[PDB]
From Swiss-Prot, chain C:
Member of the ionotropic glutamate receptor family, which plays a crucial role in synaptic organization and signal transduction in the central nervous system. Although it shares structural features with ionotropic glutamate receptors, does not bind glutamate as a primary ligand. Promotes synaptogenesis and mediates the D-Serine-dependent long term depression signals and AMPA receptor endocytosis of cerebellar parallel fiber-Purkinje cell (PF-PC) synapses through the NRX1B-CBLN1-GRID2 triad complex. It is found in: Postsynaptic cell membrane. This is Glutamate receptor ionotropic, delta-2. It comes from Homo sapiens. It comes from the Eukaryota. It is linked to Spinocerebellar ataxia, autosomal recessive, 18: A form of spinocerebellar ataxia, a clinically and genetically heterogeneous group of cerebellar disorders. Patients show progressive incoordination of gait and often poor coordination of hands, speech and eye movements, due to degeneration of the cerebellum with variable involvement of the brainstem and spinal cord. SCAR18 features include progressive cerebellar atrophy, delayed psychomotor development, severely impaired gait, ocular movement abnormalities, and intellectual disability. The PDZ-binding motif mediates interaction with GOPC. The chain holds residues 765 to 813 of 1007 of the full protein. The lineage of its organism: Eukaryota, Metazoa, Chordata, Craniata, Vertebrata. Tetramer; dimer of dimers. Interacts with EML2, MAGI2 (via PDZ domains) and AP4M1. Interacts with BECN1, GOPC, GRID2IP, SHANK1 and SHANK2. Interacts with CBLN2, but not with CBLN4. Interacts with CBLN1 (via C1q domain); the interaction is CBLN1-NRX1 complex formation-dependent; CBLN1-binding is calcium-independent; CBLN1 hexamers anchor GRID2 N-terminal domain dimers to monomeric NRXN1 isoform beta; promotes synaptogenesis and mediates the D-Serine-dependent long term depression signals and AMPA receptor endocytosis. Belongs to the glutamate-gated ion channel (TC 1.A.10.1) family. GRID2 subfamily.
Length: 344, 99, 49
């Protein structure tokens, strides 16, 4: 007797005998859970690092472009007054009115008022674009990233998938993919991903290696569903989840020697065990429901909006902490630089 | 808990600003509104957070750098509040479908 | 928009029309026609089109 997760195949029946069906076959996929993530810096995602840099440099540039106008066309400025603003003050108001703070601007010339009236209408559109794009991102954060079917797996945009080389699954998808009569987009797109680089790209040598590749990275592994359901039942971290389909042309079994007569035992006794529920008792013994984890669920369906996680707002707090730290050095220099000579 | 974090951060920054004023006073006269008091530091630290506070007098560079981080923090808080409320009120009005 | 198709055209009453039409079916059943099609429309092309 040869005993394992055997499956009906007509080819081997020319060399060994086999069981009559006791359980129908299924194809399924093993995946990693994707419950609500905590990106530490989502607060800063709406603008690119280069666009942040361009904006920052634009502040100082407009500061200088303003400052020089008080050399070029100074009006009847107040006597002995910093209404003829210094360079640093002209940098100050140029930042203090970009962030909606600040107040009155003393300038009276048309040239500078015409500059400021463009600066304000730049800033107000920057801030409205930031708010709009953030609200877009937090709206787009949605649970349709949950892959629930082979249609999703062949239409998702996030994860590469594959299987073990030369497997009857690989060959089944090949039969649905290379055949000139079969033309389903779903199967043929499964195949192409499986066919890339003559299968050398995404496939693996062993199912256990595939399972570990799923667990310790980003991958989706296609295999016998009844195996993957047990793997999901017995994943202590509840990192795995699985999905599958009801498939024809296959059923589970066990094998015997070439010409073994004991194959005559199976059928009526399997019918007994199925009608008694003894077969279903053995199935429940080996596929119990309340395992360590839910087999199919992979997302949160009740925190539709949800509060911000304290850690997800940490990237904001870093800005204040960095400001404080960078202030401490200056707050020392504000004494030590005078103490260089002691003058006041 | 995050409201409590924000409130504690406000109170902390009010103190850090007061301590920076107490360490490095300017050349101006002490003992008048040419000098800084703790509750007025809390006053401006809150008022400029709620967009209403108006002007700020501090001239010391370290304090202006911290204020420059405080205002950017405030704008990122308020923009996060509006964005999240609009998401909440947009995922509601969709997923309620017992029919 | 199917049921139109390409085909060899001949003079009226050309006796070979049926001889050619016989062989074209045999090529269509064997898959030899699908191999010749693959020679110019290789399905597993370099990139997804």
């Amino acid at each position: 007797i040869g005993i394992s997760a055997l499956t009906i195949t007509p080819d081997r029946e020319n060399v060994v005998d086999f069981t009559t069906r006791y359980m129908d076959y299924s194809v399924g996929v093993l995946l990693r859970r994707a419950e609500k993530t905590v990106d530490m810096f989502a607060c800063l995602a709406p603008f690119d690092l280069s666009l942040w840099a361009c904006i920052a440099g634009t502040v100082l540039l407009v500061g200088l472009l303003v400052y020089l106008l008080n050399w070029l066309n100074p009006p009847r400025l107040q006597m002995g007054s910093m209404t003829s603003t210094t360079l640093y003050n002209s940098m100050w108001f140029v930042y203090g009115s970009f962030v909606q703070q600040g107040g009155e601007v003393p300038y009276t010339t048309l040239a500078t008022r015409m500059m400021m009236g463009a600066w304000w209408l730049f800033a107000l559109i920057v801030i409205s674009s930031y708010t709009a794009n953030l609200a877009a991102f937090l709206t787009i954060t949605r649970i349709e990233s949950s892959i629930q079917s082979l249609q999703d797996l062949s239409k998702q945009t996030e994860i590469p998938y594959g299987t073990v080389l030369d497997s009857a699954v690989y060959e089944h998808v090949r039969m649905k993919g290379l055949n000139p009569f079969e033309r389903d987009s779903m199967y043929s797109q499964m195949w192409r991903m499986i066919n890339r680089s003559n299968g050398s790209e995404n496939n693996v040598l062993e199912s256990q290696a595939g399972i570990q590749k799923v667990k310790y990275g980003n991958y989706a592994f296609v295999w016998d569903a009844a195996v993957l359901e047990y793997v999901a039942i017995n994943d202590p971290d509840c990192s795995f989840y699985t999905i599958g389909n009801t498939v024809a042309d296959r059923g589970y079994g066990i094998a015997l020697q070439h010409g073994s007569p004991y194959r005559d035992v199976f059928s009526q006794r399997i019918l007994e065990l199925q009608q008694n529920g003894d077969m279903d008792i053995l199935k429940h013994k080996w596929w119990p429901k309340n395992g360590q984890c839910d087999l199919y669920s992979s997302v949160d369906t009740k925190q539709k909006g949800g509060a911000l996680d304290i850690k997800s707002f940490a990237g904001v707090f870093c800005i204040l902490a960095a400001g404080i730290v960078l202030s401490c050095f200056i707050a020392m220099l504000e004494t030590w630089w005078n103490k260089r000579k002691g003058s006041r």
